[PDB]
Amino acid sequence: RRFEYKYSFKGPHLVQSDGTVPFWAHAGNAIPSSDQIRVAPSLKSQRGSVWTKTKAAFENWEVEVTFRVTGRGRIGADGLAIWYAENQGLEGPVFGSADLWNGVGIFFDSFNPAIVIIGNNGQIHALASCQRDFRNKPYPVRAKITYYQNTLTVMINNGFTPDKNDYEFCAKVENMIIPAQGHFGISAATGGLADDHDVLSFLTFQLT
Amino acid sequence: QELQLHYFKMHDYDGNNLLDGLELSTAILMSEDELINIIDGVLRDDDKNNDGYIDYAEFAK
Ligand SMILES: [Ca+2]
Ligand SMILES: [Ca+2]
Ligand SMILES: [Cl-]
């Protein structure tokens, strides 16, 4: 694995003095801060997103995304999406993003809770899933998403412990083709019910 | 040299005794393209095994 700084962010100096995240663009009501990005806050009817400024061209890759979804309800909304897509996702009704993309979304759907892998070829408006309660966990939840030899695997650290390497299997998609070049991204949304959707770090690795 | 070891440690925020490009970004408003040029140069010159991390010996050459 080679760590790829230009497709990554993390604390404790995550945001620059002008409020930007180096190498990433943010939109909607995403709020970057020194130790995390609040991609959508626990207010009604929010959308926000953060996307890499440039495309990555990695044949094989792995991302480790550390996040929290926190709210007062036993039920919350809407959730968070981790993306690899040919184009930067404009705003829309899909966890803060547009409903047509070319690539793959890993959706943490609160309103369940379920984690679902959705592929798209840039011409449509669920390939595998698992049930995990990723809300209101005592330690950060982590998703490790690996694309290697045409197989997409999602592993989840459910945040019940402070062991950052305690990943368990969620889902896998075999024989998957995705864009050769694309942006990495995160989006989140809320509705009438609303959680804080916080991403502490997004760490991208090229695999060889 | 002790100043230099201090520079390395003070920028190793995750405490893995390695610097990556994000940590290096803090160790220098400079544009992101100029930042990228500088970080890429450091990694090219220092990162022997091309894993995106440099240790202290590699940093100090
Ligand atoms: Ca470090
Ligand atoms: Ca190295
Ligand atoms: Cl890292």
The structural domain count of chain B equals 1
* A36 token code pair: 């995390």
* B55 token code pair: 């240790």
* A95 token code pair: 């966890």
Quote the CA–CA distance of A87 and A122 in Å, as a whole number: 10
Domain harbouring B35, CATH code: 1.10.238.10
**How close B1 comes to chain A (CA, Å)?**
25
Short-list A194, A190, A189, CA closest to A71:
A194
- Asked if A41 and A50 touch (Cβ cutoff 8 Å), the reply is no
**Domain assignments of chain A as residue spans, ordered by start:** 1-208
* CB-based contact, A35 to chain B, within 8 Å: no
Interface with A, mutate which of B20, B22, B30, B33 (most A CBs under 10 A): B22
CA atoms within 13 A on the CB side of B40: 7
Taking CA atoms, A110 is separated from A36, A84, A167, in Å, by 20, 21, 20
Tell me if A13 and B26 make a contact (CB, 8 A cut-off).
yes
Q: Write down the residue that tokens 């595998």 correspond to.
A: A128
* CB-based contact, A8 to chain B, within 8 Å: yes
Quote the CA–CA distance of A56 and A204 in Å, as a whole number: 10
In this structure, what is the dihedral angle of CA atoms A96, A40, A138, A107, given to the nearest 10 degrees?
Answer: 0
Resolution reading in Å = 1.8
Q: Cα dihedral sign for A121, A126, A127, A130? A: positive
CATH code of the domain made up of A1-208: 2.60.120.200
Domain range for B15: 1-61
Q: What pairing do the DSSP bridges indicate for beta strands A151-157 and A168-173?
A: antiparallel
- Asked if A76 and A110 touch (Cβ cutoff 8 Å), the reply is yes
| A to B CB pairs, distance under 8 Å | 38
- Asked if A38 and A30 touch (Cβ cutoff 8 Å), the reply is yes
B13 belongs to an annotated ligand binding site: no
Identify the experimental approach: X-ray
For chain A, helix, strand, coil in percent to 5 are 0, 50, 45
Quote the CA–CA distance of B30 and B32 in Å, as a whole number: 7
For chain B, helix, strand, coil in percent to 5 are 55, 5, 40
